[PDB]
Design a protein around this ligand. Sequence first.
Ligand SMILES: [Mg+2]
Ligand SMILES: [Mg+2]
Ligand SMILES: [Mg+2]
Ligand SMILES: [Mg+2]
Ligand SMILES: [Mg+2]
Ligand SMILES: [Mg+2]
Ligand SMILES: [Mg+2]
Ligand SMILES: [Mg+2]
Ligand SMILES: [Mg+2]
Ligand SMILES: [Mg+2]
Ligand SMILES: [Mg+2]
Ligand SMILES: [Mg+2]
Ligand SMILES: [Mg+2]
Ligand SMILES: [Mg+2]
Lengths: 206, 63, 141, 141, 145, 107, 80, 69, 67
Amino acid sequence: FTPVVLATPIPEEVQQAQTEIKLFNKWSFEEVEVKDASLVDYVQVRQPIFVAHTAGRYANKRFRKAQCPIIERLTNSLMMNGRNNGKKLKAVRIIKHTLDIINVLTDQNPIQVVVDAITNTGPREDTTRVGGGGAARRQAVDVSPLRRVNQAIALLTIGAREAAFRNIKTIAETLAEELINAAKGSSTSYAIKKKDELERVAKSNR
Amino acid sequence: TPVTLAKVIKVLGRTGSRGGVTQVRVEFLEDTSRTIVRNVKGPVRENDILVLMESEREARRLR
Amino acid sequence: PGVSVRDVAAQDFINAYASFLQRQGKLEVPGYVDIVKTSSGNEMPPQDAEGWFYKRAASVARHIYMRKQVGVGKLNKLYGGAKSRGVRPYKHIDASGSINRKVLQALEKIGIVEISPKGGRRISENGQRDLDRIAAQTLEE
Amino acid sequence: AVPSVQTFGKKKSATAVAHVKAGKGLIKVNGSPITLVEPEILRFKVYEPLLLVGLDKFSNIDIRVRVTGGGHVSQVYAIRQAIAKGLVAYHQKYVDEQSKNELKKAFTSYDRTLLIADSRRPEPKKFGGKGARSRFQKSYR
Amino acid sequence: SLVVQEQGSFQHILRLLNTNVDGNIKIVYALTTIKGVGRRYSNLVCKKADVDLHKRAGELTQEELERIVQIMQNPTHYKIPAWFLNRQNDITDGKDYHTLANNVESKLRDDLERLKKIRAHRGIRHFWGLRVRGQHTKTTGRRRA
Amino acid sequence: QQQQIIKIRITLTSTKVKQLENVSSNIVKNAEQHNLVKKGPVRLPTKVLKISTRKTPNGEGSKTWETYEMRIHKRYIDLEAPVQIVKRITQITIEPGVDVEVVVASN
Amino acid sequence: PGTIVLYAERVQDRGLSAVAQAESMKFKLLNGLAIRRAAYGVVRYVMESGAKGCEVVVSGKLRAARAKAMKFADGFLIHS
Amino acid sequence: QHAVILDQEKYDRILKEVPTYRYVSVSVLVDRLKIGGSLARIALRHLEKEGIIKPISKHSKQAIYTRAT
Amino acid sequence: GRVRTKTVKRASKALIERYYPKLTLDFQTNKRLCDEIATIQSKRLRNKIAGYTTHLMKRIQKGPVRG
RNA sequence: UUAAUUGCGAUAACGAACGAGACCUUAACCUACUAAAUAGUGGUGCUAGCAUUUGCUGGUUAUCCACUUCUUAGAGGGACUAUCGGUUUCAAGCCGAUGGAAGUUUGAGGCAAUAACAGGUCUGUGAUGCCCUUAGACGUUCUGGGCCGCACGCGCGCUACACUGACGGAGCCAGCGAGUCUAACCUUGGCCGAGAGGUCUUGGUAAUCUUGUGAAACUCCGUCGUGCUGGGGAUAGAGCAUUGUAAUUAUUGCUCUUCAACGAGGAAUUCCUAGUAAGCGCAAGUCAUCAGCUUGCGUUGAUUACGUCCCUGCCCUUUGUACACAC
Ligand SMILES: [Mg+2]
Ligand SMILES: [Mg+2]
Ligand SMILES: [Mg+2]
Ligand SMILES: [Mg+2]
Ligand SMILES: [Mg+2]
Ligand SMILES: [Mg+2]
Ligand SMILES: [Mg+2]
Ligand SMILES: [Mg+2]
Ligand SMILES: [Mg+2]
Ligand SMILES: [Mg+2]
Ligand SMILES: [Mg+2]
Ligand SMILES: [Mg+2]
Ligand SMILES: [Mg+2]
Ligand SMILES: [Mg+2]
């Protein structure tokens, strides 16, 4: 709140961040509460990060990746399809642009929008093959909250990647309209369509 | 469509031909003391809140 | 108050120094600019046909300023990149020696770099006139 | 002479060495201000040790950091670990213990890597594949 | 480092060295539809002609286009250093030529029967339709040539 | 000849660290009770000579590789001693498996 | 000349030397001693010399066109 | 199939349509108008020049603009 | 993954048999006392033996351990 | 119950040995020890160049002092799944949390039992029985050619199908190596040349010099703008070089030109659980020249599951056998 002067001049905009850790420098993690219960403690907010790059060990334990911040899990699912393996700096730039584009649209907080999209597009019922081979059946099961969060990020990023492929629209924007459509609930988004398909098969295969 | 919310008390075990399902016992958050056993596909543990499209169905694939 | 070429970001220093050299008009651009590729690992000439030599000169002057001694072979490796070998995989290829050598000779003729008794080229006293004055003007603008 | 500590931070192969002496607010990395660290999108990774505890407690300090080894990401993580550990070590030696504990708790609350080096090391490659675990493709026919 | 506007005095597809050069392509890459003209050659020719590199090839005047053709046809006369050309040290007269659109097919054909009439190995391989640069023919080239 | 500085450097190289450190200890001790001004034994980085071979004398089998290693340990000590006595004490008792190089400097 | 000198010294505890025993095994086999008799002899000589264990394998064709192996062990032997 | 050369009709359409765009970028100008990417990059800089579009993020490979104020 | 081999279990068994009064519930002093009451050829094996001895002493504090 | 015939137990068995484990090597910790002009750092005897008035830096160790944090390597220490809780026949153990450099056998390996396979190698061996040949030779050498030959079938791969990109400019960061006087090896710097390369010197038998191997991916700013297009780079022409006695059947490199398929791939199928997969290069082996190969190394760094016996394979128990050259 008050300027402190150092021999190396620290800019005002980065000196403001002392009072509150935001994302890159803008988005506050407050008022990003997960409306859909059963996904709290599997959608990780309430520990702000300045940037979606935290070289964390979320793979040693089973449920440890639930504590990874949901934006970083979004970035990790972005840097995908072979030619992009690694390249988290690229994925962090895409996510920074994506969140700006979301706030340029839909003036509401882009962290909230991505959280809504995650909650809205995680399938709640799925199927599983029973029987050794094609001559078998499909039996419906319920989906754990961790798998719902996992599959939500998978469907959202896979749809954004396929939309951005072979067209003028960049990956940051295709991800932005994919998140905005999934946040509202529109069925014009890839993730909502696939989730609706998965639940439809599950109810037909109960 | 009125989906219902339940909380996992116990993780019974692993069912399915390939073990990809987990049997759990759940209690209803709304109208508690209502306890059923469900099949779950993803990684699950105790206290997990799980959303069921329909409530009246007992898990049939055991052992 | 003191400003060196370390308080200024690299890109916006090289841009401003190259613009200074261009408006100063004594860099002695060799002449075979507009045809050379700056590397055999490249396949197109620089897109800034008129100012790319000045960018390269400012980049080399800053590189000398940060280091102690730099020769042409060091510059050739530094400005070298990956070469697309077609059906074969990529490989590092050094940049053009003649461009780097003539850039260094040009900065000698202007007084930015010196003979450097134990090697190649070294930053000059006037070299740290101009680079520091540019750094100050870039910071305060 | 002047109170000073010398600490280090280590990512995979990158090592940043931080000299932290009594001063008036210097925070330099390889002779350049902390505000110029690259890559630009990871700037706040090296801002975090500054911002997590307040800038008021860098006001009477000179910090100079030199980082080598590793890569563009690892050097940033080594830098931020060096700065955090240097602030804690300086307060351990020349400030009172409560201040050192509150700095240590503030850093650890956000990231353990800020003070503890990540222990993950590369797994040696094995014959019969391109990686530690991956194998060559077999065909059976 | 600057960005400038432009105005639409434009022509669509234009004949050039008996080749349809498509407008709406930036001039350096539009000229590459002429055989014998590559990206390096087109860029150098445009720089020699003093044509602006950002003119879209449908907004060049006739005199600029004829200047471009004059340079592509006599590159040596405008200080193109002859290591930059199609046909250095020509086999039958020793002069350095840069072959253009229809001559590219023609003098490729001349290179063919010259070897084929001296019965050189490369000419014989060309006659049979096989590889001529020593590739292994056991497992590749099995769907054409 | 009589209590004169020599600027000697004794470089010890071997593949067996135990005996290499015995000779190093002997040199440092003989400098110690003879009251020398010596630069302690500097240990250079170990050199690992690696040879990677296929195990099969023919080519049949799973492609199994061996990496044989030779480890070379290098140390050196700097002394300022009269030549005669240290020559007598260091020419003698040269332990096997350790190569000793003694060189005079004009620094 | 003089820069190289050759000395010899006696192998103390001869029965604990694999190379020496293998050479004596070879000589007895070359002379014509039966494979078992020579192998047992080496085995019990190494045992008598205080060895923790000994093992002698003989492989090849032994009065038959087919070739086989036979082991002669005594005492304690480790492998890994 | 796209307008690489700017004429008065498309220029007037740009001056009427880019205002009242919540989000403006190269892809938006290429899609919602019919100009090419090169023209869109020239247009984005030019419309910033008088300020009918406001810049939010300045990056190569992604520009983010919005309505002025 | 942490099952102790009979060599550790037997050594700790014998140590408790003849050195129970000298032993404690603390691994640090238990390994410091394994150094003097037993000859173990490895520091890692000694750490395991003293760790299983400490574990069996903790078990002994709540009812006897069979055998 | 464990990775384990690893154990706890049950018990006509008891006590043992090999194998497993232990061990060894390596990776990670040590502001605690021993020290370093072949590692580094701070002051400065001595300076010195700045912009300024101390921030950035260049220099000398009888052309200085000091020190060991970072590096090195000797000796040691450190983990024993510790503490706490839960659970188990409350045992072996398993799980979670805390702490910790480290808690997946701490990671990865090296070694690795018995009994075998008519597995491969007589084309590694001056290992070798027997057979064949031994002067018009199947010995050896020399010249030339072939091993690469191309209707086609299959396996390991490289490069791609693009904008999460190509291209241009700028930023610009590794670790593992190797290297010549026991002859030309690794090559800085200067000069010339678009380039490949050439040329004159230099340092290094090497923590010293190449080399901070200034690697590529990557970052930023631009150009391009969904068009087989400035994706892709096969095929082919002309020319300049380098290695070598010799380059034609193009050794390889470079320049300009030609600019194919290919728009994400069928039935089928491989590898993989964390610094792993994948991407990206670098060194080494080979090597006069030649890597799209291998062996290592680092750089960037996921997603998913911590499970089951459905498929495949292997092991065990019960069982049937007319099999034991063992389906
Ligand atoms: Mg796109
Ligand atoms: Mg054993
Ligand atoms: Mg073992
Ligand atoms: Mg130390
Ligand atoms: Mg066989
Ligand atoms: Mg062959
Ligand atoms: Mg290095
Ligand atoms: Mg094309
Ligand atoms: Mg291309
Ligand atoms: Mg070309
Ligand atoms: Mg060859
Ligand atoms: Mg090979
Ligand atoms: Mg298989
Ligand atoms: Mg029957």
